[PDB]
Request: fold
Amino acid sequence: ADTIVAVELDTYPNTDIGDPSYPHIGIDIKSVRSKKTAKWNMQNGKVGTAHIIYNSVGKRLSAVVSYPNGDSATVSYDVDLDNVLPEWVRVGLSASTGLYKETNTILSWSFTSKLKETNALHFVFNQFSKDQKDLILQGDATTGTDGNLELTRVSSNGSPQGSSVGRALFYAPVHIWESSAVVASFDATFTFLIKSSDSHPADGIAFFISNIDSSIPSGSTGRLLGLFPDAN
Amino acid sequence: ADTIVAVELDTYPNTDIGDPSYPHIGIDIKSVRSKKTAKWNMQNGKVGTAHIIYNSVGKRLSAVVSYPNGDSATVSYDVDLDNVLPEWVRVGLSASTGLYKETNTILSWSFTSKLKETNALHFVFNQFSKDQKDLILQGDATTGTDGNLELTRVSSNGSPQGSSVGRALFYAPVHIWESSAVVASFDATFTFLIKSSDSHPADGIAFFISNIDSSIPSGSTGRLLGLFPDAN
Reply:
């Protein structure tokens, strides 16, 4: 099925599948058992920011997840993203719950990709609306009317629903790498919430880059973060 | 001595000093003796493109030199720029000749750095005006009216001079990093034209970052590319 590259904000330590025994940031190529990991003191009911970064020069997919007080987790992975990505992708946000539950609200998301000024796409959402008729919603993901994108389902009380999955995908396909392009970079920034009354939050939010017709692979909830079919 | 961090377009293999035995591109930290270099198929009198990129996350300063045919040279180097230079710098272009000579012509030059809720300087010159009131030209540097930046001396007939040093710094000091800053990233790009009618062109162009009052360290023509006092 899908070719997937992601950055997991993995809030539940699903250890029988590879995850570290704490909440982590990860870089996920073609599989949820990340190819790198780093420890992420995972705050609750607080709004945080993730910055994801990459350039076809240094070939280092990098990410930071931070919260207002200063607590920051960093993770990084060397990789020639092309060999793994097709000339054309769509990029999107994904989150899930299952069984154990957490609000997966996106307050903002912006993204830039650049191919060398030659070719560039830049978008920013600082408020989600209505019908955001330039997102391709999938699963439980819904926007507004508090200006926000609930990636996963939430009761009108504010209660996050277990076994929920969701996706937001930028409508236009992103020219992520052209072969002859000396430089092919991209960055993406989104702000999160993750409020969970439960013992542990689960499952997380993930930015991902997939093929143009990517859909929520069947039965990827909880720890599969809506990105992957099985746990390979 | 100036805190100097640079990306060299070293046309001349000054060998009794460290340069590899061919024209090269490299990242110099506090020394004209590149922390790492790469071979560079310098094309005489063709219009080239430099990109410098850095992200405080992946900690990788990276550079690409390119020509319109496809001939493209890359270099990368891991470094926390927190550690090398101050909160505040000035950025600039530099070039030089010696007894060997070449044109050090800058067609365009653009620069972005972004901190972090976000702090950001972006500037771009595609056309240098003869009274370039926001560049701090130094030494043999002059602009326009050929909508260009001449970093080293050019006789009224396009003819490079020997023993010539020129520098172009952006007027404002760049906040290149603050410690609260989750992301401290920059990039620069220039497009240049280096021609020569001696046996070999010399000596090169460079993008550099130094402290806020950086003057051309004395006697740094030819192989020191106006960045370093001597050859340590």
